[PDB]
């Protein structure tokens, strides 16, 4: 259980697992939706779907190869999967169809067919997926007029004016050897992957990606998208949090685990050791909530999201939740900290030790692109067990107590009160 990195001008990372039955090989780039502008937003989402189109997936299926891809704000992925004794064929396909030749993929017929499907994907998302479009709107009001505001799928208006030239320009600027990591997970040995690469030569482009003029900045604000015909209210609320490669990275994750997640219709979720639940269940002000701590290269967010059918008691839900947050500065106990320690270990122990090599490749490539190295799971546990009550109170006194907030909501949100009555609940006035 250890990763091995080498460099030849091309970075090559690998987590070998001898007891698996598959192998994944791919390339991860260090540019995401936070590396484009409002005019070409969605060009990366359209690159993913050109990779996964028919005539490229057909050519892989005849050889016994499956394909995958993912777009995020800091990185992109293009992965190939196979049986363990078929990994050299995986690398060849990744060489031919992607890095060297792509005139086949950017044809006039394949481009229009791909654009039609992607527009239908995005239009469907904006009309039916309410919890996820409110979290995207939160990012856009918190980080307005900065690169961390742009949605990852793109916007239906900017996505309509794209041509092949926009794709080719974006490729020449960001798909570069200086901005790339080659990964390998599952039943694959490091030496074999290194040997297979030097037998070929395998370079995409040289480097010099553009530098981004503006840095990400948090701004307290709100955006309300009112729709009285929907049957619920969906709300998300956050403060500024921690970026990746911060000293307070695990302390913010432990603090989110203290308040946790809830489903009203599951019996065992009603019995969790969370003091907020003593307040909501007597009048049943929500159906579910979840606390998050999101982290990027430049900034982060810390907060919660909720959905509810009780549209006359929204102000009691927001009030009781924000008063529990105040206790992290003033009166958090030792039992609440020892519970969140061991449940955080179980959480990220399941994220980093699933059975899917595709998830391993995305995690590995994104971490090595920032830190140059991966922190093992035995090391992360020791940092978590060394946190005390004093560290939590010091973090909360700086990040939560009387600080500005960002809010987004949709649906039946008449009962959501104004900004300054919610902002005033961030301090207790009884301390």
């Amino acid at each position: 259980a250890e990763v091995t990195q080498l460099s030849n001008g091309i970075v090559v990372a690998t987590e070998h697992n001898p007891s698996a039955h598959t192998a994944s090989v791919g390339v991860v780039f260090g540019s995401g939706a936070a590396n484009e502008n409002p005019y070409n937003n969605g060009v990366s989402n359209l690159w993913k779907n050109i990779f996964l189109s028919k005539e490229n997936s057909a050519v892989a299926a005849k050889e016994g190869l499956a394909l995958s891809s993912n777009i995020s704000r800091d990185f992109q992925s293009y992965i190939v999967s196979s049986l363990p004794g078929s990994t050299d064929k995986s690398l060849d396909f990744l060489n031919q169809s992607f890095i060297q030749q792509k005139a086949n993929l950017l044809s006039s017929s394949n481009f229009e067919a791909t654009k039609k499907s992607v527009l239908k994907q995005v239009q469907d998302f904006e009309e039916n997926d309410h919890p996820n479009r409110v979290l995207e709107h939160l990012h856009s009001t918190a980080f307005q007029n900065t690169p961390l505001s742009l949605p990852t799928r793109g916007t239906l208006e900017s996505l309509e004016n794209l041509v092949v030239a926009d794709l080719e320009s974006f490729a020449n600027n960001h798909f570069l050897n200086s901005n790339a990591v080659v990964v390998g997970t599952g039943n694959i040995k490091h030496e074999d992957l290194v040997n297979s690469i030097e037998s070929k030569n395998l370079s995409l482009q040289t480097g010099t990606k553009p530098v981004l003029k503006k840095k990400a900045a948090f701004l307290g604000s709100e955006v309300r998208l009112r729709d009285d015909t929907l049957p619920k209210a969906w709300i998300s609320l956050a403060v500024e949090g921690e970026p990746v490669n911060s000293p307070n990275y695990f302390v913010a994750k432990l603090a989110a685990q203290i308040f946790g997640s809830y489903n009203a219709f599951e019996p065992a979720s009603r019995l969790q050791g969370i003091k907020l639940l003593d307040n909501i269940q007597e009048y049943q002000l929500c159906d579910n909530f979840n606390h998050f701590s999101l982290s990027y290269k430049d900034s982060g967010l810390w907060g919660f999201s909720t959905a509810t059918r009780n549209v006359t008691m929204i102000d009691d839900l927001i009030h009781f939740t924000l008063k529990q947050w105040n206790r992290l500065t003033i009166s958090v106990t030792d039992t609440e900290v020892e519970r969140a320690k061991s449940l955080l270990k179980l959480q990220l122990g399941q994220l980093y030790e699933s059975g899917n090599p595709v998830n391993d490749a995305n995690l590995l490539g994104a971490e090595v692109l920032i830190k140059g190295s991966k922190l093992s799971l035995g090391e992360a546990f020791k940092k978590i067990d060394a946190i005390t009550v004093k560290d939590v109170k010091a973090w909360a006194g700086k990040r939560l107590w009387d600080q500005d907030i960002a809010i987004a909501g949709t649906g039946q949100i008449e009962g959501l009160l104004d900004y300054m009555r919610i902002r005033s609940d961030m301090s207790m006035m009884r301390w």
Partner: protein, 62 residues
């Protein structure tokens, strides 16, 4: 037009928000208003209560 485009707020925004300072000036004024009105409340109550003390003619015959 998309709902992800925030409108223009550049007429009203600050130097840099600088939360160390944005809280400084609002709470000096809220503190001064509470200081003066607590002193004023204390002069009003003592004016009404002292009216119940012995009058000038009662002290002259003291």
């Amino acid at each position: 037009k998309s709902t992800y485009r925030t409108p223009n707020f550049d007429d009203v925004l600050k130097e840099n928000n600088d939360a160390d300072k944005g809280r400084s000036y609002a709470y000096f004024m809220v503190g001064a208003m509470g200081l003066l009105s607590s002193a004023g409340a204390k002069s009003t109550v003592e004016t009404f209560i002292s009216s119940m003390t012995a009058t000038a003619d009662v002290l002259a015959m003291a």
